[PDB]
Design a protein around this motif. Structure first.
Motif, short mmCIF file in Angstrom:
data_model
loop_
_atom_site.label_atom_id
_atom_site.label_comp_id
_atom_site.label_asym_id
_atom_site.label_seq_id
_atom_site.Cartn_x
_atom_site.Cartn_y
_atom_site.Cartn_z
N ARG A 958 62.20 47.31 12.18
CA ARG A 958 62.20 48.72 11.81
C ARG A 958 60.82 49.21 11.36
O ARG A 958 60.66 50.40 11.10
N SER A 959 59.84 48.31 11.26
CA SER A 959 58.47 48.71 11.00
C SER A 959 57.74 49.15 12.26
O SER A 959 56.58 49.56 12.18
N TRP A 963 60.88 53.52 15.56
CA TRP A 963 62.00 53.77 14.66
C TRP A 963 61.72 54.89 13.66
O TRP A 963 62.65 55.36 13.00
N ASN A 964 60.47 55.38 13.60
CA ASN A 964 60.00 56.22 12.50
C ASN A 964 60.74 57.55 12.39
O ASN A 964 60.91 58.06 11.28
N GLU A 1069 72.29 46.93 7.48
CA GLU A 1069 71.56 47.55 8.58
C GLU A 1069 72.17 47.18 9.93
O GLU A 1069 72.01 47.92 10.90
N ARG A 1274 66.34 56.41 17.74
CA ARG A 1274 67.42 55.59 17.20
C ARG A 1274 68.12 54.77 18.28
O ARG A 1274 68.10 53.54 18.24
#
Ligand SMILES: CCCCCC(=O)OC[C@H](COP(=O)(O)OC[C@H](N)C(=O)O)OC(=O)CCCCC
Ligand SMILES: CCCCCC(=O)OC[C@H](COP(=O)(O)OC[C@H](N)C(=O)O)OC(=O)CCCCC
Ligand SMILES: [Ca+2]
Ligand SMILES: [Ca+2]
Ligand SMILES: [Ca+2]
Ligand SMILES: [Ca+2]
Ligand SMILES: [Ca+2]
Ligand SMILES: [Ca+2]
Ligand SMILES: [Ca+2]
Ligand SMILES: [Ca+2]
Ligand SMILES: [Ca+2]
Length: 1533
Positions: A958-959, A963-964, A1069, A1274
């Protein structure tokens, strides 16, 4: 990027690559597909050309084209063979053009082209595409070019994957000279040359008649052959005769077969065969040299030399396998002289001459030197017990020296004394040598050519170091050791150092006068090539990095194969050493060691790799008996010390043996220190203890009818064997057993024992009920040795478990997770050894067994598909039992498989201790059983998931910036004659352009895939995976039924393995709900009716299934209960059909989901043959997140050729994808934009219907959002576009070779949704009707054929013959202008040529029968060419051809204004005349030349014709009708 490792890091040296089945002589299915497209510039007068295509002895023919020098065929031929690669690549592909061939007379040859299969196979994709074969007269060196034949030539083996270019329209001005059918480096103009195969003498021939022999030498080269005279009754014959071939240079048939044969009236039999490779004795370019060889000896090998009435190893005498005995040695030479073809002082004949060669002496091959060969049989074990308990000798021979039974101061001892074998186990013996090792010594005499063997030894030493380094790099890539790019740079450093060392070592002894021309030229070539290899290695070392290691490894494989190519010396000096097992004087098994491997040198690099070393040899059965079931058992296993060298150099011939022995010599050798011993009596001996940590196996061979086995491993070391326990009904046993070989005795202190330990042989066996066992495979190991003074300490101790590759002969049969250590028992006893912690069975101790951590395996049970009959009964209540490492879970019982093959509980799970190292994870077994009543469970099938690495869950990154999901990103974007074929051809041209770009807009497009749709979308296994259940014994690679027959069902579902202490943020998650778990977003498991619409576009390169070389394809589609067979719509006599079909099948998903699209050859009598079929598996497509139901088009329109097929509009698809993925959207503001998540798309806001007026809509920007759905943060995913995939067609009867390419695509629409419309009209284009009117006005300067019998004046009865489609369908003749004394004819005669035309293909379409007796009309596509000819009419004989011109209706020259301005340059190869298309200008009047070839084979002007071409459509011709000739309407003068 500088630092490197110069030492071996992994343990690849402890895993030997020994195989008992070599590649030499193994047959393999091969296929040569040759597509004769057309021919141009053929040389002849009124020729009817037929292209004859020969591959080997098989020959096929095209159809006959009438009266053309530029014919067109487009005919496809397939030649099928089952032969070894060396036989197959020596076959001669000969593309010839003949004419006047009929049922009793052979055709007159125009020209031929010769090339072999191996030149085609050395191409980058094993093929030539659209290349012109240069035809030459093969019987005349002074004759010029005979024409060109454009053709494709492709060679495929079993399992080869070739990217064939797609069959686009060929509407281009193709260049002949820039696209010739030659390999790279061959000049376009090839001279003639003479190949002098000088044959001097032979030595050491065996018994062949009963007892003499009458030998001769037959040489085969490029399809030609010639033989020398017969030297009657001579074991050492002397010919001094050269066999001179005449052939083109450089030859495209690059091997020459020299074969000694024995003359006999009853049967002519081969004695020995050697193949001279012209690649190895020549070089191309300015630095190259002509093919030269000798005068030097050549060693031939074949069957055993004892005479029998019939010989089962006669194929070895033909060179079709590895030779098991020395046959003869033939002194041989080769010289190439390039002929001057313009000189008439020499004869122009090409026939093979047999002349007297100039005799050269025996001293020209080198002075004879005495060679001493020594052997010491330190160990003999693993002898096959089927040979019997009779006494066993080992006879060593070299040439005929030492062969006291069949071949023909110190006395040579060539055989060990006979020793009765002792039992090792139920399958193997061993000879009890113990302290007394038998020895052999052979005196031989060979010419002193040790320099060749030394240079080959240096090159093979560099190749061995490079191969060991690349094996190390590959292995520690596979086992994921740190920094693989550091080791490869050290490998390249060692390669460049060895290549630099070869240049300083190979310059020795250059002043010797015994060197041949080939020796000097090959030494220069090897020096230059190894210098360039060293510089290329130093350049490639800088390119080796962390991410590029895995293809520079492939680049270093090219250096390895070039070193192996250069290391093979073509001029043999010393024949190979043969070691034979004998019992009752019968030859049982052999090994063959090259004599350069045993040769001794002062220089370390010139020393052989097996000289003065104990070599592990595995004897094998001779010939074909070493393959298959007979070659499975180890025939013998020797630890044979070997030394070869000069007798002046034998001072240190005992230095490589283990120390501590006394020499026991023969009775004549008492008191002499230099006499070799006949035996060694070892006094020193070292105690040892071997620990075989047989922990686990995986992916093993199935040797029972249930698809499983009962494996146990037998471990062999020296003369001892021990067995693990039998584990029942598994292909991945966990034996977990340590076998301790106590009180082993290694006789003598072995030199370098830690670096070269004695080998361990491990054999897996399937235990059966009656005490017998099936062979399951064999792996080899080398123990990691502890000396007595060493400590049992890290990093070397304790050893780690590693995977050893098991082989059932040549096929892989799984891996064995094991570790082996060989611990020396010291002077203090066994107390120095580590302690040993189920009864007497010992487990694998702690520190060697893997450390276990707890995992959870969650299994998704989705369904079961296509369960076949177990025994004879139908499966009705299946249950899926899944087991990993002893733990497992069982699925819910399917109470009725027929009504719904689905599981009530979707996800179950279990906990299992798995190793911390994920590479050491045991495989997970899926096992479907049919749960009958009273506990009578029968096995339906079983699948082994070999790697859990695909199913291991790790938390997502997710980094990553994808994904931001914050911050707005803006992304912006006749004519009615178009159809689906317009966009298809545009996509084909576009795909060709992207294939050209990867190698180095007015029409909307789809995406043409050269492979299946599964190949570009990870086989649609994003959440749902397929596990093919298997039953029955595994088939062999030869005479087996392969894996696809053993498939008895498919299990649908997924796996998810993770460490069961999950952190709570990791579980949240992932969205862990207790109902499913990790499997989130799983779609509905309920049955749904799906309309499956299969559009079949076309097929290419279909395998012929009729006796005429063609087929009658039709499409047969099987999906569930529906079995459509479209026999009524077959396309007759076509191997590249254009179907244009659509088939609608309503299938009940997910049950009826295995789609089979097949192509069948329709036959009038008998059953219809299968050409091929493909399996599509629409369930994975239907449930995929990639949306593989209906392809999504590039641009949106509601009419015309680009009409949107999907009943769901792009806005509806976008709404569904945003709703399922929980993305906020779609947010339509104004009609030109949409906001989906953080991304805003923009585009056009209006759509046009058929009337063309505007209307606001959101579908353009919705389709722009769908095209960029991969960029969604997403749930973003690459959607499946509108496409045409190219699925290969496979036949179970001819496996491994693709024999068709079916272009199609499948659309799926759920029937609970609104239904789609009618299927797209992808039916092939109807040809537009035209009519070409050719008014032949006059002729001028026609040659006068006739001569007056009484007064001698010349005259000609000129009439014009014209046709468009052919001589048998469109021939029209003008009336005869009788008695022309000047060549002037007056005709004013109109032809009419109505024809159907395809504008895209530029082809005339016509339907006609192939012959009078043919059953149906065949569609033919020919080029649109108008042929105009001049003829002389004869009353009492046939009419005489005078001249012709063939005007291509798209690319013909513009006619001249007058007859005077007309020249020969309009119709010949001059480019100065502009080209005119009759489909554009629509009317051309002018003068055209008429050409004919004289007896000097040049063109000449034989006349000129005034003509007026006038093309109309049929509609224009009907409204302005005219008559034929001069008739009404519109009469002519
Ligand atoms: C007597 C004249 C013989 C002429 C030669 C010959 O054997 O012809 C066989 C023919 C054609 O059969 P195929 O096209 O399938 O053979 C081609 C093959 N599949 C291939 O691809 O090689 O069949 C029959 O006569 C009927 C047989 C069954 C009758 C029930
Ligand atoms: C059933 C009654 C007899 C029917 C006889 C008959 O018509 O046989 C078919 C063939 C010709 O038809 P096709 O080649 O198109 O075969 C059709 C398709 N391509 C296929 O593969 O079968 O006949 C011959 O070869 C005879 C040559 C005689 C020369 C003297
Ligand atoms: Ca004879
Ligand atoms: Ca069995
Ligand atoms: Ca068994
Ligand atoms: Ca057939
Ligand atoms: Ca047929
Ligand atoms: Ca048939
Ligand atoms: Ca005449
Ligand atoms: Ca005449
Ligand atoms: Ca005549």
């Amino acid at each position: 990027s500088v630092t490197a490792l110069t030492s071996n890091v992994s343990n690849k040296r402890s895993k030997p690559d020994i195989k008992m089945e070599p590649s030499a002589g193994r047959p393999m299915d091969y296929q040569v597909s040759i597509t004769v497209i057309e021919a141009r510039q053929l040389v002849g007068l009124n020729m009817d050309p037929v292209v004859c295509v020969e591959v080997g002895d098989d020959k096929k023919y095209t159809s006959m084209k009438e009266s053309t020098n530029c014919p067109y065929y487009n005919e496809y031929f397939v030649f099928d063979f089952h032969v070894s690669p060396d036989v197959m690549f020596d076959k001669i592909i000969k593309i010839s053009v003949i004419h006047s061939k009929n049922l009793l007379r052979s055709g007159t040859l125009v020209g031929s082209f010769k090339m072999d299969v191996g030149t085609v196979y050395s191409q980058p994709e094993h093929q030539f595409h659209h290349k012109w074969a240069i035809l030459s007269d093969p019987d005349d060196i002074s004759a010029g070019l005979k024409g060109y034949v454009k053709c494709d030539v492709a060679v495929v083996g079993k399992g080869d994957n070739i990217k064939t270019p797609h069959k686009a329209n060929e509407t281009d001005e193709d260049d002949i000279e820039g696209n010739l059918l030659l390999p790279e480096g061959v000049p376009p103009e090839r001279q003639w040359a003479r190949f002098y195969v000088k044959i001097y003498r032979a030595e050491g021939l065996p018994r062949m008649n009963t007892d003499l022999v009458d030998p001769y030498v037959q040489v085969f080269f490029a399809g030609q052959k010639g033989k020398t005279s017969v030297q009657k009754s001579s074991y050492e014959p002397l010919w001094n005769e050269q066999v001179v071939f005449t052939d083109l240079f450089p030859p495209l048939c690059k091997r020459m077969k020299v074969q000694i044969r024995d003359s006999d009236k009853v049967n002519d039999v081969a004695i020995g065969t050697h193949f001279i490779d012209l690649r190895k004795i020549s070089n191309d370019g300015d630095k190259g040299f002509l093919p030269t060889l000798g005068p030097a000896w050549v060693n031939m090998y074949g069957s055993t030399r004892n005479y029998t009435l019939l010989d089962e190893h006669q194929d070895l005498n033909e060179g079709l396998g590895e030779g098991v005995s020395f046959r003869a040695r033939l002194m041989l030479g080769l010289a190439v002289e390039i002929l001057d073809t313009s000189n008439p002082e020499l004869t122009s004949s090409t026939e093979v001459q047999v002349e007297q060669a100039t005799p050269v002496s025996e001293s020209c091959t080198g002075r004879m030197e005495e060679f001493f060969l020594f052997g010491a049989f330190l160990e003999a074990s693993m002898i096959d017990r089927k040979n019997g308990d009779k006494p066993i000798t080992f006879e060593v021979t070299i040439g005929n020296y030492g062969n006291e039974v069949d071949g023909m101061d110190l006395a040579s001892v060539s055989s060990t004394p006979p020793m009765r074998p002792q039992i090792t186990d139920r399958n193997y013996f061993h000879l009890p040598y113990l302290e007394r090792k038998p020895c052999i010594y052979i005196k031989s005499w060979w010419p002193d050519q040790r320099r060749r063997l030394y240079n080959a030894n240096i090159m093979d030493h560099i190749a061995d170091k490079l191969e060991e380094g690349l094996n190390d790099v590959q292995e520690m890539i596979k086992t994921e050791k740190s920094y693989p790019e550091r080791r490869l740079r050290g490998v390249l450093e060692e390669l460049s150092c060895g290549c630099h060392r070869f240049l300083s070592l190979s310059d020795k002894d250059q002043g010797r006068s015994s060197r041949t021309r080939l020796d000097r030229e090959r030494l220069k070539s090897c020096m230059r090539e190894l210098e360039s290899m060293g510089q290329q290695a130093k350049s490639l070392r800088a390119q080796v990095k962390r991410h590029t290691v895995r293809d520079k490894l492939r680049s270093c494989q090219n250096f390895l194969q070039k070193l192996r190519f250069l290391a093979d010396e073509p001029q043999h000096s010393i024949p190979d050493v043969f070691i034979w097992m004998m019992s009752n004087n019968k030859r049982i098994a052999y090994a063959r060691v090259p004599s350069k491997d045993l040769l001794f040198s002062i220089v370390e690099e010139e020393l052989g790799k097996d000289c003065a070393k104990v070599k592990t040899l595995f004897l094998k059965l001779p010939g074909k008996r070493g393959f298959g079931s007979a070659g499975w058992t180890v025939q013998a296993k020797l630890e044979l010390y070997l030394w070869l060298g000069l007798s002046k150099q034998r001072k240190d011939f005992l230095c490589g043996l283990p120390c501590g022995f006394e020499e026991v010599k023969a009775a004549q050798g008492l008191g002499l220190h230099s006499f070799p011993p006949i035996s060694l009596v070892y006094t020193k001996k070292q105690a040892f203890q071997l620990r075989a940590h047989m922990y686990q196996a995986r992916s093993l061979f199935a040797a029972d009818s249930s698809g499983l086995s009962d494996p146990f491993a037998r471990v062999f070391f020296i003369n001892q064997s021990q067995c693990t326990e039998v584990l029942n009904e598994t292909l991945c046993p966990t034996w977990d057993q340590m076998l301790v070989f106590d009180n082993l005795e290694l006789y003598g202190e072995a030199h370098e024992l830690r670096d070269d330990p004695p080998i361990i042989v491990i054999e897996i066996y399937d235990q059966d009920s009656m005490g017998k066992a099936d062979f399951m495979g064999r792996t080899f190991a080398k123990p990691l040795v502890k000396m007595a003074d060493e400590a049992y300490c890290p990093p070397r101790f304790p050893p780690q478990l590693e995977y050893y590759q098991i082989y059932r002969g040549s096929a892989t049969a799984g891996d064995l997770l094991a570790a082996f250590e060989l611990l020396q028992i010291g002077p203090s006893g066994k107390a120095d050894l580590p302690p040993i912690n189920r009864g007497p069975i010992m487990p694998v101790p702690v520190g060697i067994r893997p450390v276990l951590s707890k995992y959870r395996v969650e299994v998704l049970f989705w369904g079961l598909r296509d369960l076949k009959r177990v025994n004879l009964a139908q499966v009705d209540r299946p249950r899926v039992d899944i087991e990993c490492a002893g733990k497992g879970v069982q699925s819910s019982l399917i109470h009725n498989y027929k009504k719904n093959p689905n599981f009530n509980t979707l996800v179950k799970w279990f906990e299992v201790d798995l190793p911390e190292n994920e590479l050491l994870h045991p495989p997970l077994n899926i096992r479907v059983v049919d749960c009958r009543a009273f506990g009578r469970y029968t096995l339906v099938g079983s699948h082994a998931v070999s790697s859990l690495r695909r199913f291991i869950y790790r938390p997502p990154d997710r980094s990553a910036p994808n994904w931001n999901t914050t911050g707005e990103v803006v992304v912006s974007m006749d004519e009615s004659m178009l159809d689906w074929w317009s966009k298809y051809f545009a996509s084909i041209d576009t795909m060709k352009e992207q294939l050209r770009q990867h190698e180095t807009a007015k029409i909307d497009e789809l995406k043409v895939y050269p492979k299946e749709l599964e190949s570009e979308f990870d086989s649609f296994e994003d959440w749902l995976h397929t596990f093919n259940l298997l039953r029955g014994k595994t088939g062999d690679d030869e005479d087996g039924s392969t894996e696809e027959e053993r498939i008895v069902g498919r299990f649908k579902g997924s796996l998810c393995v993770y460490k069961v202490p999950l952190p709570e943020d990791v579980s949240r998650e992932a969205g862990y709900d207790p109902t499913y778990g990790m499997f989130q977003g799983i779609p509905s498991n309920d049955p749904i009716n799906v309309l499956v619409r299969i559009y079949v576009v076309r097929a290419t390169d279909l395998h012929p299934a009729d006796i005429n070389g063609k087929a009658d394809p039709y499409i047969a589609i099987k999906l569930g209960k529906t079995d459509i067979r479209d026999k009524e719509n077959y396309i007759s006599k076509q191997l590249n059909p254009v179907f244009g079909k659509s088939f609608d099948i309503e299938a009940s998903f997910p049950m009826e989901s295995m789609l089979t699209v097949a192509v069948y050859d329709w036959d009038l009598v008998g059953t219809d043959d299968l050409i091929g079929e493909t399996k599509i598996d629409l369930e994975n497509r239907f449930y995929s997140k990639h949306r593989a139901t209906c392809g999504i088009a590039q641009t949106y329109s509601i009419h015309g050729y680009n009409i949107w097929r999907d009943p769901m509009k792009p806005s509806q698809i976008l709404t569904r994808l945003c709703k399922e993925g929980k993305v906020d959207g779609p947010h339509f503001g104004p009609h030109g934009r949409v906001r989906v998540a953080n991304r805003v798309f923009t585009g056009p806001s209006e759509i046009e219907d058929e009337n063309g007026q505007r209307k606001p809509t959101d579908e353009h920007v919705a389709l722009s959002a769908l095209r960029h759905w991969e960029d969604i943060p997403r749930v973003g995913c690459r959607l499946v576009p509108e496409h045409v995939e190219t699925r290969p067609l496979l036949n179970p009867d001819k496996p491994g070779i693709e024999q068709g390419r079916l272009e199609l695509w499948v659309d799926m629409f759920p029937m609970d949704m609104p239904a789609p419309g009618t299927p797209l009209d992808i039916s092939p284009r109807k040809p537009k009707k035209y009519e070409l009117r050719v008014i032949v006005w006059n002729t001028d300067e026609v040659v006068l054929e006739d001569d007056d019998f009484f007064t001698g004046e010349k005259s000609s009865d000129i009439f014009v013959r014209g046709w468009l489609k052919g001589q048998q369908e469109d021939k029209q003749d003008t009336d005869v202008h009788y008695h022309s004394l000047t060549g002037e004819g007056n005709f004013n005669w109109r032809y009419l040529f109505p024809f159907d035309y395809l504008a895209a293909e530029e082809k005339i379409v016509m339907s006609k029968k192939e012959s009078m007796f043919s059953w149906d009309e065949t569609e033919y596509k020919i080029p649109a060419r108008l042929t105009l000819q001049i003829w002389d009419a004869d009353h009492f004989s046939a009419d005489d051809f005078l001249g012709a011109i063939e005007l291509d209706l798209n690319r013909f020259p513009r006619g001249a204004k007058t007859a005077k301005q007309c020249t020969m340059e309009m119709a010949t190869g001059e480019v100065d005349v502009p080209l005119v298309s009759i489909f554009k200008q629509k009317r051309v009047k002018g003068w055209w030349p008429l050409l004919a070839r004289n007896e000097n084979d040049e063109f000449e002007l034989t006349g000129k014709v005034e003509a007026e071409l006038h093309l109309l459509t049929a509609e224009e011709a009907e409204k302005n009708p005219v008559g034929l000739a001069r008739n009404e309407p519109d009469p002519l003068e």
